């Protein structure tokens, strides 16, 4: 399973080599050069979305199943938001094991 990020107001994209429907959860995470990795937004296979606090309003997560692509729409950005942004594909196995796959990450500078 391979994720290809691209992009880097702004909109980020990530493509999967497999069907987006075969992925339990898609998420965007960001990381400052010295800080902890923090969650941005999640979208589950069924469509439920989850945003971290003070992320609602500036971000919108969405997908395109024909394109096997998940999008991150970033608006009214501020220096407080620049980081390497990663997309994560989490796969829930029958056993309960979760395997994680990450994109190569893309830099956003504000």
């Amino acid at each position: 399973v391979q994720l290809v990020e691209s992009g880097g107001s702004l909109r980020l994209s990530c493509t999967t080599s497999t069907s987006l429907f075969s992925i339990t959860t898609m998420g965007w995470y960001r990381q400052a050069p010295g800080k902890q990795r923090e969650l941005v937004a999640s979208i589950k296979r069924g469509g439920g979305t989850n945003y971290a606090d003070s992320m609602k309003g500036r971000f919108t997560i969405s997908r395109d199943n024909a394109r096997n692509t998940v999008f991150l729409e970033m608006n009214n950005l501020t220096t407080e938001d620049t980081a390497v942004y990663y997309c994560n594909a989490a796969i829930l196995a029958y056993t309960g094991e979760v395997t994680n796959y990450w994109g190569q990450g893309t830099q956003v500078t504000v």
């Binding site: 075969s22 796969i91 056993t95």
Partner: peptide
């Protein structure tokens, strides 16, 4: 299966405890 809902690596791993001559495949997606 290697996608949501598949057994993943567990299928071949457990089988190695039962069988000596085993090959496994995990089908992505």
């Amino acid at each position: 299966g290697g996608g949501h809902g598949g057994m993943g690596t567990f299928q071949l791993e457990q089988m190695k405890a039962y069988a000596e001559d085993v090959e496994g495949h995990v089908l992505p997606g």
